[PDB]
């Protein structure tokens, strides 16, 4: 069958290059047209840019925002397309997708999480979240990067239990509440998988 | 947790051990004495005492005197007593300071409570449960035959509890499998799959399309199951102008 | 110019129902060949999207009978057959005519539909172990409602509101709602919502 399969994956800081590579697989990747369309968190996609085929002329176009220095380029002997991340930005901590076609996006690959961010790791800061008189909740703000998993009475509880997404803070940092809806005193953990730090509460009102 | 528990507990050697010993719960429970308890019921037949010293190695020696299998733990230290428990910072919590208790998954079985329960439990406060009270690993062993487990597979280099778990059903009519493990000096693979071969024997389900996967096996030709026939034929009943 | 689209951005569907979603070109999207130019296109729920439909009407290979496309020039309608729970995602209407394609235009949220629910809303006031750090967050936890249609008001103004909008479930098929109220030290020293699950503000505070 045909795969897109993605990597360049990491981190970076606003200013800095990156590589996005994608490895086509079951038709001849000469005759279609690359592009790169980017996944903004919270929306659908935007379009990056995309080379036209390689006997068309390969010539490239990127959206005006990013035009220059974003660099796409491909090759047929190693079947492999690069999008050179020149210069990344708040706006490039996004998913990333290969689409096989400059205006027939087809496959759409599997997607790349690339992140921008100027924050560093640390474990999250656990605030509760005392109910008014009703549900029991607890914060994991002041985290990143984004692996997550907050379940409740540890795993025991899973009926009620909805853990909010991630939350985007202007200083660079992630954001989530996890909550509970049930009468009654419940314990909530955290782990925070790169630094592992792993923080237990016990919510009273 | 485990490399913290022995670090801190290397010190205690010196003023008790534990011995392990097939005797039957009754005889050794009643001749117990001068700060001796038994830390494990692994069977009707099968108890592991932790004493202090100079008497728990009298009571190997009494089960020597008695002809039972004799083996002076030389990994002797101090646990499901007092010794240990004064300790309640680097005993009790220090080993365990992060957990992930799990949901019901595939029921796992603790001893310290005698009976299953939900993987809530586990973290620092079993080991201080391990480590205070006794064990009652027998009445786990019994809850598994209520909840329907026979076949026993021993995660060790050397055969010690399957060898009890074989006394589980040595009184009870609820016989059941106790794998051997690799005999004591077995240290190669010939040994893992002659043990595999074994528990496969006893029951156990191997899930042999894993085990031929990096050998790059080919399937051929075998005979077929030998159907062993009887004779079944369901003749007419009439005869003719009776 | 640019051909700019429209859809209903927020179509719902059932199970065992047949759906239509539509898309309006302000221009011609029609060629001279008589070949309409739109591209009928999902996104799964955190997954890759896929190419459902191109040329107006066709289907592309893998994708489903489920999916028909047809329309005019300027008007343009998917109806799907068999409403399944893949189906549920964000479709989107891509025009060709014109390619410098800035962004995929605001997607129809496709969502399993139920009865209108009841807005739970749930004022939690900061603990004081949130304040040592000069930081306060009073969270209005907007529970179990549907559609997604809720804006909530921050009174007694507004403005330094986050936004967080959830996983709609399986068993439930509702809404869960976070607007993170991030707060300082002295402007700590009030949450309502207009969901059509209510018609009267419910105005609880902290």
């Known amino acids: 069958e045909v795969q897109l399969v993605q990597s360049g994956g990491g981190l970076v800081q606003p200013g800095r290059s990156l590589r996005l590579s994608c490895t086509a697989s079951?038709?001849?990747?000469?005759?279609?047209?690359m592009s790169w369309v980017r996944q903004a968190p919270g929306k659908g996609l935007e379009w990056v840019g995309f080379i036209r085929s390689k006997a068309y002329g390969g010539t490239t176009e990127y959206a005006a925002s990013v035009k220059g220095r974003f660099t796409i380029s491909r090759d047929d002997s190693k079947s492999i397309a690069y999008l050179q991340m020149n210069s990344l930005k708040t706006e490039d901590t996004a998913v990333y997708y290969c689409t096989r076609g400059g205006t027939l996006f087809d496959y759409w690959g599997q997607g790349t999480l690339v992140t921008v961010s100027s924050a560093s790791t640390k474990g999250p800061s656990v605030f509760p979240l005392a109910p008014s008189s009703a549900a029991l909740g607890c914060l994991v703000k002041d985290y990143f990067p984004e692996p997550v998993t907050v379940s409740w009475n540890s795993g025991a509880l899973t009926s009620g239990v909805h853990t909010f997404p991630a939350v985007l803070q202007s200083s660079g940092l992630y954001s989530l509440s996890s909550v509970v809806t049930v009468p009654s005193t419940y314990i909530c953990n955290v782990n925070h998988k790169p630094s592992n730090t792993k923080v237990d509460k016990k919510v009273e009102p | 947790v485990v490399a913290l528990r022995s670090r801190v507990i290397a010190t205690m050697p010196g003023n008790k051990g534990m011995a392990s010993i097939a005797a039957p719960a009754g005889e050794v429970r009643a001749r117990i004495g001068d700060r001796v308890e038994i830390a494990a019921v692994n069977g009707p037949r099968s108890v592991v005492v932790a004493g202090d010293s100079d008497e728990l190695d009298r009571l190997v020696a009494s089960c020597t005197t008695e002809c039972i299998r004799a083996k002076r733990l030389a990994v002797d230290y101090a646990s499901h007593s007092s010794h240990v428990e004064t300790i309640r910072d680097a005993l009790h919590a220090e080993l365990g300071e992060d957990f992930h208790p799990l949901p019901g998954f595939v029921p796992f079985f603790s001893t310290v409570t005698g009976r299953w329960t939900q993987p809530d439990e586990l973290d620092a406060g079993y080991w201080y449960r391990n480590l205070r009270r006794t064990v009652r690993f027998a009445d786990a062993v019994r809850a598994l035959a209520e909840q329907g487990y026979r076949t026993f597979l021993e995660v060790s280099a050397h055969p010690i509890l399957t060898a009890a778990i074989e006394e589980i059903g040595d009184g009870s009519g609820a016989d059941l499998s106790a794998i051997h493990s690799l005999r004591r000096g077995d240290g190669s693979l010939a040994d893992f799959g002659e043990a595999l071969s074994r528990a496969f024997a006893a029951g156990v389900a191997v899930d042999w399309e894993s085990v031929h996967l990096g050998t790059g096996a080919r399937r051929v030709p075998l005979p077929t199951y030998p159907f062993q026939r009887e004779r079944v034929w369901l003749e007419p009943k009439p005869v003719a102008r009776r | 110019d640019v051909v700019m689209t429209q859809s209903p951005l927020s179509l719902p569907v059932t199970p065992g129902e047949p759906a239509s979603i539509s898309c309006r070109s302000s221009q011609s999207l029609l060629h001279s060949n008589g070949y309409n130019y739109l591209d009928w296109y999902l996104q799964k729920p955190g997954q890759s999207p896929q190419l459902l439909i191109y040329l107006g009407s066709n289907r592309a290979s893998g994708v489903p009978d489920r999916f028909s496309g047809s329309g005019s020039g300027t008007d343009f309608t998917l109806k799907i057959s068999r409403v399944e729970a893949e189906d549920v995602g964000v479709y989107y209407c891509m025009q060709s005519l014109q390619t410098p394609r800035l962004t995929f235009g605001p997607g129809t949220k496709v969502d399993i539909k139920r009865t209108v629910a009841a807005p739970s809303v749930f004022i939690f006031p900061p603990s004081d172990e949130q304040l040592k750090s000069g930081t306060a967050s009073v969270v209005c936890l907007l529970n179990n409602f549907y559609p997604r249609g809720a804006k909530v008001q921050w009174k007694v103004q507004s403005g330094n509101s986050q936004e967080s909008v959830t996983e709609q479930d399986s068993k439930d098929s509702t809404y869960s709602l976070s607007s993170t109220l991030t707060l300082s030290k002295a402007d700590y020293e009030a949450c309502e919502v207009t969901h059509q699950g209510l018609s009267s503000p419910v105005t609880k505070s902290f």
């Open positions: 079951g038709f001849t990747f000469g005759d279609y047209a």
